[PDB]
């Protein structure tokens, strides 16, 4: 996002990042991670703003989960 993709009016994801994350979704854990991880790139959540917001939300929730271990 800081590589100056555009002058950033309302950007969109490249196709290689989306194909990399749909590869990583099949290389994820099968039963319970995938139906929630897939619900965050099918519904046009990648637009370089809600994608990063989703990743920050998931990172914070995962760090609280791993800190309550």
């Amino acid at each position: 996002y800081n590589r100056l993709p555009f002058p950033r009016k309302n950007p969109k994801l490249p196709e290689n990042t989306e194909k990399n994350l749909v590869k990583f979704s099949t290389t994820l854990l099968a039963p319970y991670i995938r139906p929630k991880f897939n619900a965050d790139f099918i519904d046009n959540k990648p637009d370089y703003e809600t994608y990063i917001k989703r990743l920050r939300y998931w990172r914070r929730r995962l760090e609280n989960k791993l800190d309550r271990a």
């Binding site: 996002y1 800081n2 002058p7 950033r8 920050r56």
Partner: protein, 139 residues
């Protein structure tokens, strides 16, 4: 990076707000009726706005004074941190290793010893980028 995150979360921030602030203030000047086509002056003024609004330049020193229960310990820690950071800067300077972000620099809070991980040198494919010449000083 851990010390920076503790300082940011001790106040009402989180350090991705710095990226949001620089992105918003860098994107608010690309618009029409150009107030700053020069990126350097705008980058310097948002650097000063980050250093004043968000993270002052006394965070690391205040964290390490609050860390030790005596000033003898902080003074000896700083005396060893300066020498170990000098050795780290030499190991980063010689062999041309890459960007030393603050999550790649580790510090021992009982000695002052500084080390780093990801000690990968930077090899550029060009022979074209050089202040020195191409032909005479090296063949």
């Amino acid at each position: 990076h851990e010390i920076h995150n503790e300082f940011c979360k001790k106040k009402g921030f989180d350090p991705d707000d710095i990226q949001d602030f620089m992105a918003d203030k860098l994107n608010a000047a690309h618009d029409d009726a150009l107030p700053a086509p020069d990126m350097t002056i705008l980058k310097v003024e948002i650097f000063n706005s980050i250093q004043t609004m968000f993270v002052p330049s006394n965070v690391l020193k205040d964290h390490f004074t609050s860390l030790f229960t005596q000033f003898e310990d902080f003074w000896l820690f700083r005396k060893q941190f300066a020498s170990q950071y000098s050795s780290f800067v030499f190991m980063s300077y010689m062999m041309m290793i890459n960007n030393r972000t603050p999550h790649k620099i580790h510090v021992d809070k009982t000695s002052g010893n500084v080390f780093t991980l990801e000690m990968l040198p930077s090899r550029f494919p060009y022979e074209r980028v050089k202040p020195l010449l191409k032909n005479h000083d090296l063949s």
